[PDB]
Structures are given as C-alpha cells and as structure tokens.
C-alpha cells in the first residue's frame, strides 16, 4: 500500500498492524535472516579457523558456543574434529532457505489477511482470548527446547565442564539438583558484590536442574493459558492492543540483554574461561599470581612483607578470614576460577601449598591468561591499555558484553517508546492534541 | 548606471546569492578550504615539527593536518614571496607558511560570511540577529587562532587545522595552562551544553504538541505552511513544564531569544578566557590549598591530584611536542608515580 | 473510600507540581539524595580511596572552594560490594570508606530513572504525544554510563566519577590516559552532537527572532507584544525561509517546521547516545583506535606522527596516576 | 585556613549591588499603575 491509508514511508512497516497475512511474512522472513546469519558466521569463522591455537586467540564469537555444548571439543579443550562445527552452520543455512521462501510466500502470494483462510490462525489484536491462546503454544514450544537442552545434558553426549578434578572439560551430568531450596531461593541472593544474582551458578548442574523447572514451568504456562482467560485485574491494566504487545516484549527483551551482558562478562561457569578467554576479574587475578610465583621461585619469600604502597608486596589478609592478592587485584578477592580455587586453602591461599601444588597446566595456563587481560581497540591495538603496539587483540568475551549491552540499552528506549505510543493510541489522542477541545484548556488553573 | 548596473547584478536572484560580500567571501573562502585540503594531502610537516603528519606519508585521515611554522621562525606572516620564502614555492610550503595562508584567507573569508549574513537582511527585511549570533565563532576563531598565538613566542603555538591536530592542542592546555579549572571556560561548558540541552528540549516539546492537521499517523506532511495559527499549543506546553520542572516559558519570543543568547554568551565568556590565557594569566593554584599542602603531604584533594597529572603531561609531552627547545629529560626526572 | 480518593489525588493534575506514580519513588529518593548530598558535600570526613596511605578531603569544611570540593567515591578496599549503612561496622567506618558516595548515586540514579517516566506519565494525562521521555534518555544514558556502568568495567566504584567540579576534571584526564577517548569515534560524534545542538540552537533561535511580526512600538520592549495565547503566527516563515534560502542555496531550507523541529531534536540526542555508548565501549576495555607508527622510513626510524604525541601524553599521565 | 583578607567584601558587593539594582527596578514596576 501507499501512505494514503497508512502513514509515511520511513516508518512504513507499522502499516502491517492490521494485516496478519503480511505479518507472518515479516517474521518468518526475519527469522530466516537470523538463522542464515548464524550458520554464515559459523562457516565464515570455520574457514579462517585455526584448530591448534586457542579459541579466544582466534577472535571467535560463535564456535565457542557450539563447542560449549561439548561437540568436537575433547578434553584439554582440544577442539578435536571440526566436522561437528561444520554441520551446525550449514544446517541453519539450509533451514533459512526454507524460511525466507515461506516468508516470501506470506509476503506476496499468501493471503493478505488470515481472518478467513484459517479461522484458527486468525486473530484480532484487541481480542484478549484467541491471542492468549497463541501465547500458550510458544510458551509450550519455548519450554520444550529448554528440556531439549537437558536432553543434551543428561542423555546425548554431555555438556562442557568448567571444573573437572582435572582438565575442566567434559562430563555427562547424572543427578541434576532440583528443589526450591537452592533454586527459587537461588535468585533471591543479592545482585551486588560477592554474590551474583543469577551470575553465580557455581555448579554446572544448577543450570540443568534449573532448566528442568523452567522446562516444567513453561509447559504449565501453556496448559495454564490454553485452558484459561485473563482475569479482571489483568483486563483493567495492560492496554490490550497491537502495539503494547510489542512494547511489553521489549522491556522483557531489554532486561534480558543486561543479564546476558552480565554473564559473558563475569560468569566463568557457563562460559569456560578456557576457550572464551579469561574473565576480566580473572585476568588481573591470574597475572597477579604469575608475578607471585616467578619471584617466590627465586631467592625471595613474599609471605610476610610490606610494599612501597604499604599493603604488602603480594598477599594481604582481608577483613574476612581469607587472605588474598594485593595490588589492584584486591578489588577482586571474590573471584574463584578453576585453577585458583584448589590453590586456595581453608582461609585464603595456603602459601606453603601454593609453592608445591602448582600443576603443569595451571602455571602455564595461569600465565597464558597474563598475556590476555581484556583490552584492545576497534582496529585491535592490544596489549596493556597504554602498552605500545604489542600483543594486539580484543578478547571475544569483551565483544559480546559490549555488543549486547548497546543493543540492550536501545531496547529499553524502544520499550519506553512504544509503551508511549501504545497507550496514547488506545487513549486515542496519539494523533496529536485536538484543536477543537484542548484537554488542558478547561481545567482548574493553579 | 555604471556602478548602478553592477549593483543590481550582484543583488539579482540566482541559484546562490552573491552579494558585495561574495566578492570578498568566495575567493577568500574557497582558498581556505582549497588550501587546507592541499596542505593536508601533500605538504609535509617535517622541517617544522620534525614529525611528519600529512596525507602523502603513511598517515591516516584523522592524524593529518597542516602544522605551524616553528618557534624560531617567529611571528612573521610568511608571505609567498617574503624575505624568507623569497618567492620560492617549495620552501614556502615546507616552512608551513601554508598554515598562515589558511588562517588569514580563512579569517577574511570568515568575515565575508558575516557581511553576507548582513547583506541578506537589508534586502530581505529580517532583523539581523543571525549575523550577531554568528559573532561568537568569530570571537572564538579570532581568540584561539590569532590572539592566542600572538601571546606566545611565535605562531608555533596554535591549532594545526586537523582532527588529531586539535587534540594535541587540547591536552596541550591541560598540561600547561590547566584549562579545565579556568572559570571563564566553565561559562563556556554551560553555554554549549545549555545550548545543546535546550536545543533538544525545545525540539522535543513542540514535537510532542501538534494540532493534528493531517490524517495519517505520521505528522510531517500533515503540516500546511499557509497563514496558519501556531502549529503547536503554547498553552499545553506551558502548563506541562510548569508542573514537572516547575518553570516554563510563556513567550515564543522570549523563548527563542533565550536560545540565541546562551550559546553565544557561552562562547564569548570562553573567548575571554583564552585571551586571558594568551598572556599566560592561566587560572591555576589556589593560594589557599597550596600553602596548606606545604603544611603536610597527607592532605589531599581532587585538586591536588590534578597538579600531579598536569605535571606528568608537561614532562612527558614536552620533548616530542617542543623539539625546538631541545629538551632532554633524564629518566628518573620524569615525575613518575609510585614516587 | 480513602484509597480511591487518595489514588485520585496522586494522579490529579491540579497540583502545582505533578507527582505521578513515578513521583512516589522519585520525590522521596531525590529529596533523600540531595539531603544526604549537600551535607556530605559540606562535611565529609577525609574519605580514603586506598586504605594504604592517603586520605582525601573533598569536603567543603576543609579548605575547599566549590571548585575543589567533591564527594570522594568509594575506596578500592570496599571494591564494588554493596555497602549500606548497617552492613558497615561503625558509622565512622561507613564514612571513612566512602559510603556517602555509594549512597547518593543509587538514590540518584534510581531517582533519575523514575523521573524519566514521570515526564511520561504526565504527558499521557495532558493528552499529548509523549516522546519527551525518549529525548530525556540521552542524559540518563550518560548518567548510568559514567556513574553506574564504567566502574563495573573496573569492578570498583573508585574509578567511578567523583562528583564535583574538580572531581570531574580529574576523572576525564585520567580516563583520557587509559582509554584514549579522544581518538575514539563515538566520542568524536558526540562532539558533533553537542555542537550541532548548540549550533542549531543558535540559528533556529536566531532566524525566528530575526523575523517578528511587529506588535510593539520601538520604545517599548519587543518581547511584550507577544500575547500569551496568540493564535496568530508570531514569526513569518515566508520571510525567514528565503533568508536562509538565499544565504545558502534555496533547496535545503526545510520548509516544514514540523520537519525542522524534529531534526532540531534528533541531532543533539542521537549525538549524545553514542557517547554513553562510547563510554560503555571503553568500560569493557575496547578503546579508541590509536594509530601508532603508522609511518616508518626504510631505515626503521620512527617518523613520529602526531598521534604518538598524544600516545605519549597519555603514556605520560598513566605513569603519574600510578 | 589562611585567605585573602579582603576577599569577603568582594562577594558581598558583587552579590548585593547587582541584586539590589534588580530589586529597585522591580519594586518600581510593581508600583506602576
């Protein structure tokens, strides 16, 4: 159509509000892109990929995910056979070829409105029933996949392990932890320093046992909504209407972003520091220890000591019973990484033990995290922040958290945008104030 | 009608409008830009600052510009013939005389724009709050690029007319002249922001109040600019802001005139400080705290911490920035932290 | 009923200051921020940034002009931990470690957010298109960026902005040392966003003041002729159009005010968003590209382009800080 | 702490005289019939 029935072109998509036949055409096509983009990067990365070196060295934002589900990884993070990585990407491409094809089919030759061809698929935005019916199915389907994760966890192969008694790699969970004690009460923790909100997740088996609930909660959700219908208090609020639905989606989707921003940047459990690169807190942390061992190795005892700043050269005693590293690192005494925790004793680090208990991998790996402390530039000028033209990288762990944040930020605005236009639309004056009768015109004048 | 016929020709209606100022402007202007690009691409700055930033060396877009003739080259205007260039073109570019070529041809050009911004008026009938508003960049341009260098040993101290050039000019104040704390520059940051702020808040309010002259959701084409009443109700906007921020504007006249005011007054009161800083009158250590700092090292303020910063910038930047002085600092002498 | 009547009073528009439901958070939190601010700004014990050595007095009672005075942010010893009153051992302990900072910015931010909505839920109740809250996101983006976000990238509120006129200057310079923000592109747009805001603020301010249908005598003030509620157009577009339309070519003059004023409000805003993105890009240590040794001779010597000077100045600062 | 001894008068006159000069003009306007 044209602007005559509608509004201007630069915004022209929302001309689709009342056409569902075109609307499916949009999403299915759009979903086609997202899928197609997924496999593309996979193959794109796979062509430039070097299996020998580590993953974070490669500037690789995707293969780690596929790997994290334990395909082609091997112990030691070996990245054994790339063929599973190849299969994933190409399949999504072939899947997209179907999607957009359909997306086009609804875009043009498909019926311009669905209220007729299929009454079941037909829906009116203002209807608070047949729509809620739809909300069930997805909430069922979206709940299926959550379980389908656990199908990978408990049954097929096994998911990545952050902490193994050695090598920290591959395990098939046997008993998932489930109960409201450590699950519902889990998110009840403080968001702030020392206790992550959802970002703690010490044990892997939390997420699996956790997703079980989210698996079995959502399946209830559909069965709940499919068999129910909004109550009074629901009807009085929420502004049932085409826009608002999009507006709510944003707010949820926005807050998801900031959370996703938080995991990648902090949590080591889900994203293993191994092939996602070391977490920012771990970076300076591990570096602080490599300095420790290299000096403690040779003719020096750093245990009881003072520094030029006065706090000591390496180790300090926190206000808590545990003793930590000094320097800037002291701001992170909360970090517990796969390599560090065993080195730690009952309260803080056991110095006598630190010297002896070092492994071949630990010290090497702990030093391997020294070179990469998340940093870098847009042209990828790396090394320590002002270090001059050496070791040029930006750890992928830093990209995601940056990226998703910026996007997540906008969606806050977006949410705060449509929610305005949604309600004002329902309120009817979204079209602009009415020149005949100004609502302000007749009011008590303060 | 000898002189006459000439007049009407200049004042006629064509694609653009070339006024009496146009004779001054376009030649003077087109050379400035026309010069800058050339000096940007080809003319090196090497013999001047000893460091080549220019486009024909490896250098990028951001880090190229036209540097300035060196310190011991002095305040001479470096004409094309000159005593120094002696009518030799090459050595007139290498000495950076092209810099001065930009400023002067720029200034008069910059003037010629102002005059145009008058000469439009008297043959239109608008009041000339435009030109007068435009005097602020004038003052800023003149103060920064002209009054400030003349208050120094030579032209050498001045912006180099480039993206990165202007930055080595920025930190150049923070280290030496301690510019941020200069109160005349705080009035500036008021003006600019206060301009940007109220720029956005006006454009938002009037955009949130519209009489709905058109049908379609998007109201742009909905506007008909024929003898209309005000396209947005002041009544609403007034009672609106008065209940949120508490204070509103009841005069379209008094509002806009207040937009013109703040950015302008923002720059002038900055253009004063720069002049005051051409003489190295720079706002600097408060005698109160300094003396107090001499009564104990432990006393520390976010002021005192700046003095170390402004101290480090100086020492480190000095040798590179000012090779002519032939500074060599030893290693330990640099005012390093952890000491 | 009391509630149904009370609810009607909060929402009510007759108030000299509209308090929406967001005002229920906004008013107490900000009023609690300011009170705990001005006091803490005036009397702050010499808050310590590092428990090692150096207490810092940013308080006003100790020898500080408004310029030098600031509220010191929390220490590094406290790290990023949530550090309320009661959690701290002693009251003086809570001040000596920089409590009042961590207290103000929380109530401030959480106050600033609800404000962003309070502008909205008034606009909805006056029957007017509600996009102001979009425009207001630009500062609020910057607020969260410099106060809340950037320290998360550093894991400690110490690196957060010390709030005060000298504190801010200290912040940028040090921030300039590490991340080389000037060469960063997002900032380099933010400048354009601010200037072009101030710029357009002058022209659109000027051109309309230039053109005034004259209801006034020459002796009388020119402003007073405007009668609040004039349904006449106070300023000729036809006159001012050709003006800017002659000054430059007639094609670009933006005939439509509704087209203009939007563009008037798009340029500064979008300009600012990139900065609050430019910071968050920095907080994660993704820095502005610094072209360095972009030039070299065949002899391996460094031709030393300008950016190196900056690269040195920053390298100069960082050593100074520590 | 030590201070410019006369600096205080500066503020007072810089506060009052411009202030007062605005009042006097204003109170007049209030008296306009």
């Amino acid at each position: 159509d044209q602007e005559s029935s509608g509004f201007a072109w630069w915004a022209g998509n929302a001309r689709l509000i009342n056409l569902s036949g075109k609307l499916l055409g949009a999403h299915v096509a759009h979903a086609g892109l997202i899928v197609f983009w997924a496999g593309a990067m996979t193959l794109f990365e796979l062509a430039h990929f070097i299996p020998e070196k580590p993953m974070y060295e490669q500037g690789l934002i995707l293969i780690p995910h596929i790997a994290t589900l334990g395909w082609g990884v091997g112990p030691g993070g070996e990245v054994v056979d790339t063929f599973p990585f190849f299969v994933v990407g190409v399949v999504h491409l072939i899947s997209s070829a179907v999607l957009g094809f359909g997306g086009v089919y609804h875009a043009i030759r498909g019926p311009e409105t669905l209220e007729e061809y299929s009454s079941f698929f037909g829906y009116d935005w203002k209807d608070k029933n047949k729509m809620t019916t739809i909300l069930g199915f997805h909430l069922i389907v979206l709940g299926i996949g959550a379980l389908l994760l656990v199908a990978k966890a408990m049954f097929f192969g096994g998911l990545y392990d952050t902490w193994a008694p050695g090598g920290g790699d591959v395990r098939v969970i046997t008993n998932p932890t489930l109960d409201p004690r450590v699950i519902f009460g889990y998110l009840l923790k403080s968001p702030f320093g020392g206790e992550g909100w959802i970002v703690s997740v010490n044990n892997l088996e939390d997420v699996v046992g956790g997703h079980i609930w989210i698996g079995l909660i959502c399946i209830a959700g559909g069965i709940w909504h499919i068999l129910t219908t909004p109550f009074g208090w629901a009807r009085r609020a929420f502004i049932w209407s085409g826009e608002a639905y999009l507006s709510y989606s944003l707010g949820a989707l926005s807050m998801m972003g900031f959370i996703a921003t938080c995991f990648v940047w902090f949590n080591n459990t889900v994203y293993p520091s191994e092939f996602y690169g070391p977490t920012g807190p771990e970076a300076s942390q591990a570096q602080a220890m490599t300095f420790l061992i290299r000096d403690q190795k040779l003719g020096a005892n750093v245990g009881s000591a003072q520094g030029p700043t006065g706090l000591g050269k390496y180790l300090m005693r926190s206000p808590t019973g545990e003793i930590i590293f000094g320097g800037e690192t002291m701001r992170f005494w909360d970090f517990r990484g796969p390599w560090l925790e065993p080195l730690r004793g009952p309260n803080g680090l056991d110095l006598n033990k630190i010297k002896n208990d070092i492994q071949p991998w630990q010290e090497r790996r702990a030093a391997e995290y020294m070179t990469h402390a998340p940093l870098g530039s847009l042209n990828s000028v790396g090394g320590v922040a002002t270090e001059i033209n050496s070791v040029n990288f930006v750890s992928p762990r830093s990209w995601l958290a940056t990226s998703h944040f910026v996007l997540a930020f906008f969606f806050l605005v977006g949410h705060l945008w449509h929610a305005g236009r949604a309600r004002a639309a329902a309120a009817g004056f979204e079209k602009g104030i009415d020149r005949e009768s100004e609502p302000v015109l007749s009011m008590p004048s303060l | 009608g000898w002189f006459d016929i000439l007049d009407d020709w200049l004042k006629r209606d064509r694609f653009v409008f070339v006024g009496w100022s146009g004779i001054l402007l376009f030649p003077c202007a087109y050379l400035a830009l026309g010069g800058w690009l050339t000096g940007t691409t080809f003319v090196t700055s090497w013999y001047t600052h000893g460091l080549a930033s220019s486009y024909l060396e490896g250098c990028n877009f951001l880090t190229v510009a036209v540097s300035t003739p060196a310190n011991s080259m002095g305040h001479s205007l470096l004409l094309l013939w000159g005593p120094e260039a002696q009518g030799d073109f090459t050595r007139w570019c290498q000495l950076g005389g092209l810099w001065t070529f930009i400023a002067l041809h720029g200034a008069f050009g910059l003037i010629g724009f102002m005059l145009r911004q008058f000469e439009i008026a008297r043959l239109v009938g608008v009041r000339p709050y435009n030109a007068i508003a435009f005097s602020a960049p004038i003052a800023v341009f003149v103060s920064v690029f002209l009054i400030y260098p003349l208050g120094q040993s030579s032209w050498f101290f001045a912006p180099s007319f480039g993206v990165a050039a202007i930055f080595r000019f920025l930190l150049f104040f923070q280290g030496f002249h301690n510019w941020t704390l200069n109160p005349f520059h705080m009035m500036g940051v008021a003006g600019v922001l206060g301009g940007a702020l109220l720029c956005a808040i006006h454009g938002a309010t009037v955009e949130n109040t519209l009489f709905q002259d058109g049908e379609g959701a998007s109201t742009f084409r909905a506007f008909n600019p024929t003898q209309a009443e005000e396209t947005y109700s002041m009544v609403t906007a007034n009672r609106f802001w008065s209940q949120i921020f508490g204070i509103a504007f009841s005069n379209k006249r008094w509002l806009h005139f207040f937009m013109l005011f703040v950015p302008v007054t923002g720059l002038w009161m900055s253009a004063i400080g720069v002049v005051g800083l051409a003489l190295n009158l720079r706002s600097y250590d408060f005698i109160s705290q300094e003396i107090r700092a001499a009564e104990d090292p432990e006393f520390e303020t976010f002021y005192t911490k700046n003095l170390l910063l402004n101290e480090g910038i100086r020492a480190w930047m000095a040798p590179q920035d000012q090779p002519h002085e032939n500074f060599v600092f030893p290693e330990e002498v640099l005012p390093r932290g952890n000491a | 009923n009391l509630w149904e009547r009370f609810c009607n009073w909060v929402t009510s528009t007759d108030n000299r200051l509209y308090v929406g439901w967001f005002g229920v958070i906004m008013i107490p939190t900000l009023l609690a921020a300011t009170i705990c601010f001005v006091i803490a700004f005036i009397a702050a014990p010499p808050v310590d940034i590092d428990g090692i050595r150096e207490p810092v007095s940013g308080s006003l009672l100790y020898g500080n002009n408004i310029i030098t005075g600031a509220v010191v942010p929390s220490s590094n010893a406290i790290g990023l931990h949530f550090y309320p009153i009661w959690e701290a051992a002693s009251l003086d302990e809570w001040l000596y470690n920089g409590g009042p900072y961590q207290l103000i910015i929380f109530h401030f931010l959480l106050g600033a957010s609800c404000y962003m909505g309070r502008q909205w839920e008034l606009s909805y109740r006056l029957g007017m298109r509600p996009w102001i809250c979009v425009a207001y996101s630009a500062p609020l983006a910057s607020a969260f960026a410099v106060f809340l976000i950037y320290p998360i990238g550093q894991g400690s509120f110490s690196d957060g902005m010390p709030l005060g006129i000298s504190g801010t200057f200290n912040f940028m310079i040090v921030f300039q040392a590490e991340h080389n923000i000037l060469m960063h592109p997002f900032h380099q747009l933010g400048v354009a966003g601010v200037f072009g805001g101030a710029l357009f603020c002058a022209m659109h301010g000027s051109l309309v003041t230039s053109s005034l249908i004259r209801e006034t005598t020459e002796t009388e003030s020119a402003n007073y002729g405007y009668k609040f509620g004039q349904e006449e157009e106070t300023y000729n577009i036809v006159a001012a159009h050709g003006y800017f339309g002659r000054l430059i070519f007639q094609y670009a003059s933006f005939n439509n005010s509704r087209s203009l004023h939007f563009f008037l409000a798009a340029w500064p805003v979008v300009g600012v968003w990139f900065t609050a993105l430019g910071i968050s890009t920095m907080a994660f240590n993704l820095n502005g590209f610094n072209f360095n040794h972009s030039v070299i001779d065949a002899k391996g010597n460094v031709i030393n382009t300008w950016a190196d000077i900056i690269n040195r100045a920053n390298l100069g600062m960082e050593v100074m800080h520590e | 702490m030590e201070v410019n001894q006369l600096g205080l008068i500066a503020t007072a006159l810089f506060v009052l005289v411009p202030s007062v000069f605005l009042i006097i003009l204003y109170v007049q306007t209030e008296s306009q019939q």
């Binding site: 004048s445 | 009544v235 204070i247 009841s250 | 005036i42 006003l60 002009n65 609040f228 509620g229 | -």
Partner: peptide, 30 residues
C-alpha cells in the same frame, strides 16, 4: 569565613528556587 560564604551563597539559591516556583505570577490565557 571561607566556607560560610559558600553555604550562604548556596542558601539563597535554594531560597530562590522554592520562592520562584510557587510565587510566580500565573501567565493567564488571553
């Protein structure tokens, strides 16, 4: 001396705010 001037100056600001918000002459329509 030093400080007590600032608080004074800063006080009259507030005493202006509260004073300028509530006591402004309403700009009536027409």
């Amino acid at each position: 001396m030093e400080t007590i001037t600032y608080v004074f100056i800063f006080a009259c600001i507030i005493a202006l705010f509260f004073f300028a918000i509530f006591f402004r002459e309403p700009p009536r329509i027409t």
